[PDB]
Amino acid sequence: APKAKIVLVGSGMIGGVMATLIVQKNLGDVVLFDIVKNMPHGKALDTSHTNVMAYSNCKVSGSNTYDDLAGADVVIVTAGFTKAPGKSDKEWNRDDLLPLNNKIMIEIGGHIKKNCPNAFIIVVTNPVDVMVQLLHQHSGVPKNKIIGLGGVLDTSRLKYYISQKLNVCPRDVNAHIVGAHGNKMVLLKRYITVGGIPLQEFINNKLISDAELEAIFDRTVNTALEIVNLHAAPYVAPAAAIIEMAESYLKDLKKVLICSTLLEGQYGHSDIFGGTPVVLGANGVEQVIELQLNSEEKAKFDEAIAETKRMKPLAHH
Amino acid sequence: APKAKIVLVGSGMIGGVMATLIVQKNLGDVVLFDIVKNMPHGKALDTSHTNVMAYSNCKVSGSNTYDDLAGADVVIVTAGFTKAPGKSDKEWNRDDLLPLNNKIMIEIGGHIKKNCPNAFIIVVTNPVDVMVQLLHQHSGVPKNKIIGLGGVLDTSRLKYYISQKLNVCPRDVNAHIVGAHGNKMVLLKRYITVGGIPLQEFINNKLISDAELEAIFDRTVNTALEIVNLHAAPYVAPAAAIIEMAESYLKDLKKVLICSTLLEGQYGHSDIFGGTPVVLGANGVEQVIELQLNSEEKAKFDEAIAETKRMKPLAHH
Amino acid sequence: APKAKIVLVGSGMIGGVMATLIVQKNLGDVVLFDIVKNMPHGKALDTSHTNVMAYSNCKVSGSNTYDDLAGADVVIVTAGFTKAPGKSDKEWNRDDLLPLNNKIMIEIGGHIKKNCPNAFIIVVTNPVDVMVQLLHQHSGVPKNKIIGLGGVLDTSRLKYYISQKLNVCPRDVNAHIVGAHGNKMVLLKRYITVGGIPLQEFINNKLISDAELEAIFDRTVNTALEIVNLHAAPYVAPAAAIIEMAESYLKDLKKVLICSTLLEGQYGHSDIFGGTPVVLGANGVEQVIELQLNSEEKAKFDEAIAETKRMKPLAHH
Amino acid sequence: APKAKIVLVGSGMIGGVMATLIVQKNLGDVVLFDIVKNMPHGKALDTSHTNVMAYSNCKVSGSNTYDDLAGADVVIVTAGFTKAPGKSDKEWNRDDLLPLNNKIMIEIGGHIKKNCPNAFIIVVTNPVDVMVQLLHQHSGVPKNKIIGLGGVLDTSRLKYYISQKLNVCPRDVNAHIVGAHGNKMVLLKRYITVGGIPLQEFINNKLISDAELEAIFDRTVNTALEIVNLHAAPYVAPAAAIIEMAESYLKDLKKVLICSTLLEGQYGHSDIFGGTPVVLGANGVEQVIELQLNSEEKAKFDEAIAETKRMKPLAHH
Ligand SMILES: NC(=O)C1=CN([C@@H]2O[C@H](COP(=O)(O)OP(=O)(O)OC[C@H]3O[C@@H](n4cnc5c(N)ncnc54)[C@H](O)[C@@H]3O)[C@@H](O)[C@H]2O)C=CC1
Ligand SMILES: NC(=O)C1=CN([C@@H]2O[C@H](COP(=O)(O)OP(=O)(O)OC[C@H]3O[C@@H](n4cnc5c(N)ncnc54)[C@H](O)[C@@H]3O)[C@@H](O)[C@H]2O)C=CC1
Ligand SMILES: NC(=O)C1=CN([C@@H]2O[C@H](COP(=O)(O)OP(=O)(O)OC[C@H]3O[C@@H](n4cnc5c(N)ncnc54)[C@H](O)[C@@H]3O)[C@@H](O)[C@H]2O)C=CC1
Ligand SMILES: NC(=O)C1=CN([C@@H]2O[C@H](COP(=O)(O)OP(=O)(O)OC[C@H]3O[C@@H](n4cnc5c(N)ncnc54)[C@H](O)[C@@H]3O)[C@@H](O)[C@H]2O)C=CC1
After folding, report:
1. Ligand 1: does its nearest atom lie under 6 Å from the Cβ of A151?
2. Smallest-distance ligand from the CA of D11
3. First to last CA, chain B
4. D197 and C289: CB-CB below 8 Å?
5. C-alpha of D147 from chain center
6. What CATH number labels A149-315?
7. Strand boundaries in chain B, DSSP class E
8. Which one of 3.30.230.70, 3.30.420.40, 3.30.70.330, 3.40.50.720 gives the CATH number of domain B1-148?
9. Closest by alpha carbon to C306, among C263, C266, C264, C269?
């Protein structure tokens, strides 16, 4: 009935574009919560005027008070740091953000548990597969109620780069990147399709070569780094990917979207979060889809999970 | 610059929903042309008021004059009959429409050639793979400028039925039905994916069985018949499929959409139209994608084409 | 959480376009209920495939069982007749539909009371201002939970016709037509704006003359008749207007939309429904806005209400 | 045919959100041009991946080369500075930006004249009513082909603030702010409507008081300042307003939108740009609407224009 209340814990660059897109889509009332005094109110105010241009009617409010999490239907956590200190852009590594963000998850998780234990949570803060589980553990939410951003975004890059080479609608390329959001992300060439057709047929037709695809894979993995090194920050597509996830939940679209979710034996892994296709609908994570990987792909998946696992103890520290 | 002018040659049930959806999408000015006196003006008038609710600004005009094809950017041909005479609903067969519609294509084609030889044409009238080629031949338009409706619609049924069984977003099922739009349409189980994942994995996981899929295939092929026999007429999804095609053209989306197009050696066939994925963009049919079918699938494709071919001489009569 | 369930009581022409638009907009699951055997299932089936083209995920089901009203969040009543018997198109009068539809409202109202007493109801069946109150009285729903279609549709015509003369975006003309949906509808020249600017300025600028506006008023009042007499049936804009209302409710947009609602002293009238701007949001009819009419406009409003009132006793018969 | 090419001259905060919204809306290919090395490529890259989530197909490219203006259909100029040096946020005044941005307009104008003299131009850089005319004069474009941002944005604030007080859909408040975008902007209480109804009726009904409206007017005028002083920057609504303008042009919507345009006697003013409602369509500024202001309102309009005029000679310096 009342619109969904969507609290953006973190009102930085991603938060700002998420607020924008929520109003564009009329998805629900938005709270831009941040620890920075007044900034979220300023961003909220600005954003709120777009209801007029968008023909929407979503309240957009800023907050510097954790208890505004109360009544949240969806909580999207981008709170934290994008860069580590003393580290240059060339040395940008999501792993280095771990010391910086760990303590922030715990605190937010405690606030979510107190204020909106029944909210659907999307964790973004890097290293996301680690931060999401830490938040899961501190917020107390059901495993079907929290996920991390990764695959929707990593695959939008891969999908997009292939679509440009093949000159097809970007969305008509489908692809899977799993395990973790980071330099070990697992790009599954075998699960790439174009217009539902195995990418291998386009390779057989010399429309795109294996070499080009290897360069696209490399680019995909290094995209965040590439953007950081172009004197920009990746936040527009991250926001759009998060909103697509939040939207599938809110409107019960049941889209299959690759997100970081609690693995309970899939791919041989339990007690960790990892990226895999899930179905996001009214009941949250409605299905966790386990790709029937081959042994080579599973080996890569293990390598990705091993990285998340390695940082599990460091996060919890 | 000026909006696209979209002439709907045929202002019956499909025409009406196409006009509706064009205004909803603000795709261009619409002409509802029909041979029935005044009906198209009445439908156009009604439809035109929806600009207000849709926040659009597309003119919608009725026409009983072929020369209103002048300046058309897109021409969508639904002109003809849905049912044959003396034939009951249980005996509904698209082939029987051939005697009834053949002469209508020729005439329209002559008008298109005179009035809008550079228009992009979408032929719908059944039996579509036959009628489209007849129109192609009489209108004189380039082969990259005309297609027939079939696969977008047949696959929306298959996609939809599978998505309901697997509880995923309908659009997340991708599937291919090729050769012809009719009882010989070729359903390619091998090219079905769900969230980009081979349907076989869901079958392996007992999430959907082969038997269920065979029933869904049967239903898909018989859908039009099923609808006709429920005391309804299939026209809403046909319209939406046509609009999705027209939209990809008009907005240069480059979607891969299975349509009836002139085959020039694909699948071993030339000098006939058949359903296959194509990319529809600014330049019309930008790419004709040839699925690398196996011999069994190709045999079915041949059977479908053989039917179109069989009726080629009857149409031209 | 679960999508809204929208039951279309009546699955005829308006019902069909409403189902189409609901899926286009992803507004909720739809039930096409009708007394005609199987037709609604056929229409629902057809419509359901458009989820694919629309990227939506709304179930569309047919029903021939009143109890499928159970759990309805919104009920839209188009059940009834568009034309009276023996009456020609030239003699088409909404009043004549009263004998034909009265008994249908009562029955539906009883089913709504039993099955979905907390649903938001939109009554369309003509003569709507009479049928809506009859349904209100039999369904038992709160006065903030039921309205009739009229002004959104009548004004879309007026708005549209003026926008064409002035060459502005249709939605940029705002206008009010109140009292009743019928030949006594009250067109308030004084409340017409174009881009928020009094229409009188455009008249002063000779951009549109009083005479042209009087012809547009006449056309607006006679539009339904004009469409019927063009061998068409007004149902596309009616559907779009109803969906805009249903949408404002469902998404809590709080749009000001002129609908038939229970008057409780506004304009000097009580215990009757009449068309006036209301605000439709999460709580239904959130505000009933009383235009501060002058005495001349109020006299017309009285004339409109007098007609509804005259038929009140005949309906209840 | 080919999509519109939209060059965003200036790829800062507003530019970034404009690129985002263009892809969301699939409006055309986008070039993010900036003088800052590589930043626009980084932003373009990020933005480009959203085609996937948006189902769009708009190229988004960065540029550090003026000649990428070639072939532009629309040019949106945000190039310049938001704050003056040594000036604190509390002292933020658009006028102070004049020395900083004047030289930038001239240069861009010369590039537009050389590269895309037939492009439709939207100038944003402050003080906009001054910068727009300077660009007009240097680019050589027809007066119907260039406008400045102001009223769509200033009025979205006023509209929004009133809609919150009255609890109606933001877009249902219409209002006019004219003359100039700055502290002398002219808020015309007399032209405010809510759901097409004179705001005075809501004031008469004590739904909003004159005092509240005066506070809302003050807030509206000071909004940019308020946002700057909340540790934020107004750029989301500016972007949305610009896109709504660009969109009306590109899709020939003919929306009435208040923009800065060349006055040729309206309001008694010639040879200057000032904010007034215009109709934006395929042919650019299709109509310049002159509000029939009273003498008090005209006096304010003169005060606003006098400010633009005062800075005319300083800009040209
Ligand atoms: N999972 C994924 O695919 C990716 C994740 N990222 C991670 O997203 C996070 C957000 O990126 P951006 O928005 O660009 O960063 P940002 O630095 O722009 O925004 C983060 C903000 O969170 C704040 N914040 C810090 N502590 C907080 C607390 N306790 N509560 C609320 N707010 C708090 C900040 O003050 C700040 O505004 C980073 O860790 C980045 O690496 C970014 C791209 C995609
Ligand atoms: N290709 C595909 O996947 C399918 C094709 N169809 C074919 O679509 C066609 C249209 O279906 P509906 O709209 O439902 O039929 P309909 O009978 O509602 O509409 C067809 C209309 O075309 C008219 N017409 C006849 N001759 C004409 C001429 N020379 N010029 C202009 N108009 C003319 C009619 O008067 C009429 O209004 C039929 O042949 C149907 O079988 C329908 C569903 C999908
Ligand atoms: N309020 C407004 O502005 C206007 C109201 N109308 C009224 O809308 C109603 C619907 O128009 P259309 O859809 O075009 O008519 P239609 O005749 O196409 O559809 C009406 C249908 O309701 C059915 N029906 C009859 N009794 C029923 C029952 N007990 N339960 C469920 N379904 C039942 C029919 O079988 C039928 O399919 C008519 O009374 C028309 O005058 C139409 C235009 C606007
Ligand atoms: N007209 C209106 O209603 C308002 C106008 N503004 C004016 O909009 C302009 C843009 O605001 P923002 O995007 O926030 O600023 P910003 O500082 O974020 O972006 C401006 C950028 O333009 C650049 N630039 C400078 N010289 C350039 C050149 N020769 N060519 C291309 N790019 C160049 C910058 O490097 C920079 O990235 C400012 O003057 C601001 O005051 C902002 C809000 C609304």
Report:
1. no
2. 4
3. 42
4. yes
5. 8
6. 3.90.110.10
7. 5-9, 29-33, 60-63, 74-77, 120-123, 146-148, 173-174, 177-178, 186-187, 193-194, 197-198, 255-264, 270-281, 284-288
8. 3.40.50.720
9. C269
